[PDB]
Short mmCIF file of all heavy atoms in Angstrom, two decimals:
data_model
loop_
_atom_site.label_atom_id
_atom_site.label_comp_id
_atom_site.label_asym_id
_atom_site.label_seq_id
_atom_site.Cartn_x
_atom_site.Cartn_y
_atom_site.Cartn_z
N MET A 221 -6.48 -11.87 27.17
CA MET A 221 -6.97 -10.57 27.62
C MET A 221 -7.77 -9.95 26.49
O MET A 221 -7.23 -9.58 25.44
CB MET A 221 -5.79 -9.69 28.03
CG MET A 221 -4.88 -10.35 29.08
SD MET A 221 -5.71 -10.63 30.66
CE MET A 221 -5.86 -8.94 31.27
N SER A 222 -9.08 -9.86 26.69
CA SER A 222 -10.00 -9.53 25.60
C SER A 222 -9.80 -8.15 24.94
O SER A 222 -10.08 -8.01 23.74
CB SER A 222 -11.45 -9.71 26.05
OG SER A 222 -11.75 -8.81 27.10
N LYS A 223 -9.32 -7.15 25.68
CA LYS A 223 -9.17 -5.79 25.12
C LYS A 223 -7.76 -5.46 24.58
O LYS A 223 -7.50 -4.33 24.14
CB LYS A 223 -9.65 -4.70 26.10
CG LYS A 223 -11.02 -4.92 26.80
CD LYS A 223 -12.18 -5.16 25.82
CE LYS A 223 -13.51 -5.18 26.57
NZ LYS A 223 -14.59 -6.02 25.96
N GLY A 224 -6.86 -6.45 24.60
CA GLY A 224 -5.50 -6.26 24.08
C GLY A 224 -4.76 -5.21 24.88
O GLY A 224 -5.13 -4.91 26.01
N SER A 225 -3.70 -4.64 24.30
CA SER A 225 -2.85 -3.67 24.98
C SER A 225 -3.63 -2.49 25.54
O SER A 225 -4.60 -2.02 24.94
CB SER A 225 -1.77 -3.16 24.03
OG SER A 225 -2.30 -2.20 23.13
N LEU A 226 -3.18 -2.01 26.70
CA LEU A 226 -3.67 -0.76 27.28
C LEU A 226 -3.51 0.45 26.35
O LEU A 226 -4.33 1.38 26.39
CB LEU A 226 -2.96 -0.48 28.60
CG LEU A 226 -3.35 0.80 29.33
CD1 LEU A 226 -4.84 0.84 29.68
CD2 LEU A 226 -2.46 1.01 30.57
N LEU A 227 -2.49 0.44 25.50
CA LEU A 227 -2.27 1.54 24.58
C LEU A 227 -3.40 1.59 23.55
O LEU A 227 -4.00 2.66 23.34
CB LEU A 227 -0.88 1.42 23.95
CG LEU A 227 -0.39 2.48 22.97
CD1 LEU A 227 -0.35 3.89 23.56
CD2 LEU A 227 0.99 2.08 22.48
N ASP A 228 -3.73 0.44 22.95
CA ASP A 228 -4.87 0.36 22.01
C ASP A 228 -6.18 0.68 22.72
O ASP A 228 -7.02 1.39 22.18
CB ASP A 228 -4.98 -1.03 21.39
CG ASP A 228 -3.72 -1.46 20.71
OD1 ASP A 228 -2.91 -0.57 20.34
OD2 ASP A 228 -3.52 -2.70 20.54
N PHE A 229 -6.35 0.16 23.92
CA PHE A 229 -7.54 0.42 24.66
C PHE A 229 -7.77 1.92 24.79
O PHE A 229 -8.83 2.40 24.40
CB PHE A 229 -7.46 -0.20 26.03
CG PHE A 229 -8.77 -0.31 26.72
CD1 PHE A 229 -9.80 -1.07 26.16
CD2 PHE A 229 -8.97 0.29 27.95
CE1 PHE A 229 -11.02 -1.19 26.80
CE2 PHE A 229 -10.19 0.19 28.61
CZ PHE A 229 -11.21 -0.55 28.03
N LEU A 230 -6.78 2.65 25.31
CA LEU A 230 -6.93 4.10 25.57
C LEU A 230 -7.12 4.93 24.29
O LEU A 230 -7.76 5.99 24.32
CB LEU A 230 -5.73 4.64 26.35
CG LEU A 230 -5.36 4.10 27.74
CD1 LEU A 230 -3.94 4.48 28.10
CD2 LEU A 230 -6.35 4.59 28.78
N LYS A 231 -6.51 4.46 23.19
CA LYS A 231 -6.56 5.10 21.88
C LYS A 231 -7.81 4.76 21.08
O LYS A 231 -8.15 5.47 20.13
CB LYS A 231 -5.35 4.67 21.03
CG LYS A 231 -4.06 5.37 21.35
CD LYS A 231 -2.86 4.62 20.74
CE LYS A 231 -2.62 4.93 19.23
NZ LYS A 231 -2.63 6.38 18.89
N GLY A 232 -8.49 3.68 21.42
CA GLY A 232 -9.72 3.30 20.71
C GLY A 232 -10.98 3.97 21.23
O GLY A 232 -10.92 4.92 22.00
N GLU A 233 -12.13 3.43 20.80
CA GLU A 233 -13.47 3.96 21.12
C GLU A 233 -13.78 4.08 22.61
O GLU A 233 -14.62 4.88 22.99
CB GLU A 233 -14.56 3.14 20.41
N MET A 234 -13.11 3.30 23.44
CA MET A 234 -13.29 3.39 24.89
C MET A 234 -12.61 4.59 25.51
O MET A 234 -13.05 5.10 26.54
CB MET A 234 -12.75 2.13 25.56
CG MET A 234 -13.68 0.97 25.46
SD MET A 234 -15.21 1.46 26.27
CE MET A 234 -14.77 1.39 28.01
N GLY A 235 -11.50 5.03 24.92
CA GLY A 235 -10.75 6.15 25.48
C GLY A 235 -11.65 7.33 25.76
O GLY A 235 -11.59 7.94 26.82
N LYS A 236 -12.52 7.64 24.83
CA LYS A 236 -13.43 8.76 24.99
C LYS A 236 -14.33 8.67 26.23
O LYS A 236 -14.73 9.71 26.75
CB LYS A 236 -14.19 8.97 23.66
CG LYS A 236 -15.68 9.17 23.71
CD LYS A 236 -16.23 9.23 22.31
CE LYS A 236 -17.55 10.01 22.31
NZ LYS A 236 -18.29 10.00 21.00
N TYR A 237 -14.63 7.47 26.73
CA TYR A 237 -15.52 7.30 27.90
C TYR A 237 -14.81 7.15 29.27
O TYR A 237 -15.44 7.25 30.32
CB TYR A 237 -16.45 6.11 27.69
CG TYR A 237 -17.23 6.21 26.42
CD1 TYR A 237 -16.78 5.58 25.26
CD2 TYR A 237 -18.40 6.95 26.36
CE1 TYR A 237 -17.48 5.68 24.09
CE2 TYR A 237 -19.11 7.05 25.19
CZ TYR A 237 -18.65 6.41 24.05
OH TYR A 237 -19.35 6.49 22.87
N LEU A 238 -13.51 6.88 29.25
CA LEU A 238 -12.75 6.79 30.46
C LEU A 238 -12.61 8.16 31.19
O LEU A 238 -12.42 9.21 30.55
CB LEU A 238 -11.38 6.17 30.16
CG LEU A 238 -11.41 4.74 29.60
CD1 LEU A 238 -10.01 4.31 29.21
CD2 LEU A 238 -12.03 3.74 30.57
N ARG A 239 -12.76 8.15 32.51
CA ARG A 239 -12.55 9.34 33.32
C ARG A 239 -11.51 9.01 34.40
O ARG A 239 -11.10 7.86 34.54
CB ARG A 239 -13.84 9.85 33.99
CG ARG A 239 -15.02 10.24 33.09
CD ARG A 239 -14.82 11.58 32.44
NE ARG A 239 -14.40 11.34 31.08
CZ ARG A 239 -15.11 11.65 30.01
NH1 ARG A 239 -16.27 12.29 30.12
NH2 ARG A 239 -14.64 11.35 28.82
N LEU A 240 -11.10 10.01 35.16
CA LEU A 240 -10.10 9.80 36.19
C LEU A 240 -10.34 8.58 37.09
O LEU A 240 -9.41 7.80 37.28
CB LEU A 240 -9.91 11.05 37.03
CG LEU A 240 -8.48 11.16 37.57
CD1 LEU A 240 -7.48 11.38 36.43
CD2 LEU A 240 -8.43 12.26 38.57
N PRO A 241 -11.57 8.38 37.60
CA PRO A 241 -11.73 7.23 38.50
C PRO A 241 -11.39 5.90 37.83
O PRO A 241 -10.77 5.04 38.46
CB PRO A 241 -13.21 7.28 38.91
CG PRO A 241 -13.63 8.71 38.65
CD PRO A 241 -12.84 9.12 37.44
N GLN A 242 -11.75 5.72 36.56
CA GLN A 242 -11.37 4.49 35.84
C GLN A 242 -9.84 4.39 35.66
O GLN A 242 -9.24 3.34 35.94
CB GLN A 242 -12.09 4.36 34.50
CG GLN A 242 -13.60 4.13 34.62
CD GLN A 242 -14.35 5.39 34.98
OE1 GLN A 242 -15.21 5.37 35.84
NE2 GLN A 242 -14.02 6.49 34.33
N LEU A 243 -9.22 5.47 35.20
CA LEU A 243 -7.78 5.48 34.95
C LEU A 243 -7.00 5.31 36.24
O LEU A 243 -6.01 4.62 36.25
CB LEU A 243 -7.37 6.78 34.28
CG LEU A 243 -8.13 7.11 33.00
CD1 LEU A 243 -7.71 8.47 32.57
CD2 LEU A 243 -7.89 6.07 31.90
N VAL A 244 -7.47 5.91 37.34
CA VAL A 244 -6.74 5.80 38.60
C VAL A 244 -6.80 4.37 39.08
O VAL A 244 -5.83 3.83 39.60
CB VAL A 244 -7.18 6.84 39.67
CG1 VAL A 244 -6.62 6.51 41.09
CG2 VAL A 244 -6.66 8.19 39.23
N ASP A 245 -7.95 3.76 38.84
CA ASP A 245 -8.14 2.35 39.18
C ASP A 245 -7.21 1.40 38.42
O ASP A 245 -6.64 0.47 39.00
CB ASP A 245 -9.56 1.96 38.90
CG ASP A 245 -9.83 0.57 39.34
OD1 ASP A 245 -9.81 0.36 40.56
OD2 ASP A 245 -10.04 -0.31 38.49
N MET A 246 -7.06 1.64 37.12
CA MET A 246 -6.14 0.87 36.29
C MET A 246 -4.69 1.05 36.74
O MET A 246 -3.91 0.09 36.77
CB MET A 246 -6.29 1.25 34.81
CG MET A 246 -7.64 0.91 34.24
SD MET A 246 -7.90 1.46 32.53
CE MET A 246 -9.14 2.69 32.83
N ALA A 247 -4.33 2.28 37.07
CA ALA A 247 -2.99 2.57 37.55
C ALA A 247 -2.69 1.75 38.81
O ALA A 247 -1.60 1.18 38.96
CB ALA A 247 -2.87 4.02 37.83
N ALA A 248 -3.68 1.70 39.71
CA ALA A 248 -3.56 1.03 40.99
C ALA A 248 -3.40 -0.50 40.80
O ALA A 248 -2.61 -1.14 41.48
CB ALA A 248 -4.78 1.34 41.84
N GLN A 249 -4.18 -1.06 39.88
CA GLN A 249 -4.03 -2.46 39.49
C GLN A 249 -2.64 -2.76 38.99
O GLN A 249 -2.06 -3.77 39.39
CB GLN A 249 -5.02 -2.81 38.39
CG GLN A 249 -6.44 -3.04 38.85
CD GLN A 249 -7.34 -3.32 37.68
OE1 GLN A 249 -7.99 -2.40 37.17
NE2 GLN A 249 -7.36 -4.58 37.22
N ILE A 250 -2.12 -1.90 38.11
CA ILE A 250 -0.76 -2.05 37.58
C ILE A 250 0.24 -1.95 38.74
O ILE A 250 1.15 -2.76 38.85
CB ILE A 250 -0.42 -0.97 36.53
CG1 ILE A 250 -1.28 -1.11 35.28
CG2 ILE A 250 1.07 -0.99 36.15
CD1 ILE A 250 -1.36 0.25 34.47
N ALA A 251 0.06 -0.94 39.60
CA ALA A 251 0.98 -0.72 40.71
C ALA A 251 1.02 -1.95 41.59
O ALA A 251 2.07 -2.34 42.11
CB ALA A 251 0.56 0.49 41.53
N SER A 252 -0.15 -2.55 41.75
CA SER A 252 -0.28 -3.76 42.52
C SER A 252 0.55 -4.90 41.90
O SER A 252 1.27 -5.61 42.62
CB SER A 252 -1.76 -4.11 42.65
OG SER A 252 -1.91 -5.41 43.17
N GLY A 253 0.45 -5.07 40.58
CA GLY A 253 1.27 -6.02 39.87
C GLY A 253 2.75 -5.74 40.09
O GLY A 253 3.56 -6.66 40.37
N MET A 254 3.12 -4.46 40.01
CA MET A 254 4.51 -4.08 40.12
C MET A 254 5.01 -4.22 41.56
O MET A 254 6.19 -4.50 41.80
CB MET A 254 4.75 -2.68 39.55
CG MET A 254 4.80 -2.59 38.02
SD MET A 254 5.89 -3.81 37.22
CE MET A 254 7.53 -3.46 37.90
N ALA A 255 4.10 -4.08 42.52
CA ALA A 255 4.41 -4.35 43.92
C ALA A 255 4.78 -5.81 44.10
O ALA A 255 5.70 -6.13 44.85
CB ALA A 255 3.26 -3.97 44.81
N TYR A 256 4.11 -6.70 43.38
CA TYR A 256 4.48 -8.11 43.45
C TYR A 256 5.92 -8.30 42.93
O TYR A 256 6.76 -8.91 43.59
CB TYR A 256 3.45 -8.98 42.73
CG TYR A 256 3.84 -10.43 42.60
CD1 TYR A 256 3.78 -11.30 43.70
CD2 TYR A 256 4.26 -10.94 41.36
CE1 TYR A 256 4.14 -12.65 43.57
CE2 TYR A 256 4.63 -12.27 41.23
CZ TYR A 256 4.57 -13.12 42.33
OH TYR A 256 4.94 -14.44 42.15
N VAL A 257 6.21 -7.72 41.77
CA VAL A 257 7.53 -7.76 41.16
C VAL A 257 8.64 -7.23 42.09
O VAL A 257 9.72 -7.84 42.20
CB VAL A 257 7.51 -7.00 39.81
CG1 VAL A 257 8.92 -6.73 39.28
CG2 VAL A 257 6.69 -7.79 38.80
N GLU A 258 8.35 -6.10 42.74
CA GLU A 258 9.19 -5.48 43.75
C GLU A 258 9.51 -6.49 44.86
O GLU A 258 10.69 -6.79 45.10
CB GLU A 258 8.44 -4.25 44.29
CG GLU A 258 9.23 -3.21 45.07
CD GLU A 258 8.38 -1.96 45.31
OE1 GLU A 258 7.53 -1.95 46.24
OE2 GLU A 258 8.53 -0.99 44.53
N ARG A 259 8.47 -7.04 45.49
CA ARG A 259 8.64 -8.07 46.54
C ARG A 259 9.39 -9.31 46.07
O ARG A 259 10.16 -9.88 46.83
CB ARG A 259 7.31 -8.57 47.10
CG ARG A 259 6.47 -7.56 47.83
CD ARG A 259 5.31 -8.27 48.55
NE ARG A 259 4.22 -8.72 47.68
CZ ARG A 259 3.30 -7.92 47.15
NH1 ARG A 259 3.33 -6.61 47.39
NH2 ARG A 259 2.34 -8.43 46.39
N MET A 260 9.14 -9.75 44.84
CA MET A 260 9.82 -10.94 44.30
C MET A 260 11.23 -10.61 43.86
O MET A 260 12.00 -11.49 43.49
CB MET A 260 9.03 -11.54 43.14
CG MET A 260 7.68 -12.07 43.52
SD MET A 260 7.81 -13.40 44.72
CE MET A 260 8.51 -14.73 43.72
N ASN A 261 11.55 -9.32 43.87
CA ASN A 261 12.90 -8.86 43.60
C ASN A 261 13.32 -8.93 42.13
O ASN A 261 14.50 -9.10 41.81
CB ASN A 261 13.90 -9.62 44.47
CG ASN A 261 15.05 -8.77 44.86
OD1 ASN A 261 16.17 -8.98 44.38
ND2 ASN A 261 14.80 -7.79 45.72
N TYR A 262 12.34 -8.78 41.26
CA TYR A 262 12.60 -8.69 39.84
C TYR A 262 12.55 -7.23 39.37
O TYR A 262 12.28 -6.32 40.15
CB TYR A 262 11.60 -9.54 39.06
CG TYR A 262 11.85 -11.02 39.15
CD1 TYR A 262 11.44 -11.76 40.27
CD2 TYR A 262 12.51 -11.71 38.11
CE1 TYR A 262 11.68 -13.15 40.35
CE2 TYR A 262 12.74 -13.08 38.19
CZ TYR A 262 12.32 -13.80 39.30
OH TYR A 262 12.56 -15.15 39.37
N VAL A 263 12.83 -7.04 38.09
CA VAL A 263 12.91 -5.74 37.44
C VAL A 263 12.23 -5.94 36.09
O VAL A 263 12.56 -6.86 35.36
CB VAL A 263 14.40 -5.33 37.24
CG1 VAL A 263 14.57 -4.40 36.07
CG2 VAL A 263 14.94 -4.66 38.48
N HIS A 264 11.28 -5.09 35.74
CA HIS A 264 10.62 -5.28 34.45
C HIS A 264 11.50 -4.74 33.30
O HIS A 264 11.82 -5.48 32.37
CB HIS A 264 9.22 -4.68 34.46
CG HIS A 264 8.44 -4.96 33.21
ND1 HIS A 264 7.45 -5.92 33.16
CD2 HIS A 264 8.52 -4.42 31.98
CE1 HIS A 264 6.94 -5.94 31.94
NE2 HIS A 264 7.57 -5.05 31.20
N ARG A 265 11.87 -3.46 33.38
CA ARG A 265 12.74 -2.77 32.40
C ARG A 265 12.04 -2.30 31.14
O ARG A 265 12.64 -1.61 30.33
CB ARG A 265 13.94 -3.63 32.01
CG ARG A 265 14.92 -3.91 33.13
CD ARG A 265 15.45 -5.32 33.00
NE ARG A 265 16.25 -5.51 31.79
CZ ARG A 265 17.58 -5.60 31.78
NH1 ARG A 265 18.27 -5.50 32.92
NH2 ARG A 265 18.22 -5.79 30.63
N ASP A 266 10.79 -2.69 30.94
CA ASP A 266 10.04 -2.15 29.81
C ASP A 266 8.56 -1.94 30.17
O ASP A 266 7.66 -2.30 29.42
CB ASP A 266 10.21 -3.03 28.58
CG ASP A 266 9.74 -2.35 27.29
OD1 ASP A 266 9.64 -1.09 27.19
OD2 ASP A 266 9.44 -3.11 26.36
N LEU A 267 8.35 -1.36 31.34
CA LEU A 267 7.02 -1.07 31.81
C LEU A 267 6.49 0.18 31.09
O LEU A 267 7.09 1.24 31.14
CB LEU A 267 7.01 -0.90 33.33
CG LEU A 267 5.65 -0.54 33.94
CD1 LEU A 267 4.63 -1.68 33.78
CD2 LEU A 267 5.81 -0.13 35.39
#
């Protein structure tokens, strides 16, 4: 994953250019991943 952690991403030079539509989109992608986990009946515990 070329941009590393989401935490570094948001805190670095890109953070300044992100707006709600980008962030909402990322949230939805994550939610989608977590929906898979939900269906597969797992638990992350450190999301």
Side-chain angles (χ1 to χ4, degrees), residues 221-232 234-267:
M221 306 295 289
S222 63
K223 313 305 188 209
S225 77
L226 179 60
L227 182 59
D228 305 338
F229 196 61
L230 300 163
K231 281 164 81 49
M234 281 300 285
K236 133 185 205 187
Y237 305 95
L238 298 174
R239 301 283 101 114
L240 210 66
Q242 293 76 226
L243 306 173
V244 168
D245 185 67
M246 296 176 247
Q249 282 177 265
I250 294 158
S252 169
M254 283 311 300
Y256 173 75
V257 167
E258 197 170 80
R259 296 191 285 284
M260 296 299 289
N261 214 251
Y262 286 80
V263 153
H264 186 103
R265 295 143 65 105
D266 194 22
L267 178 67

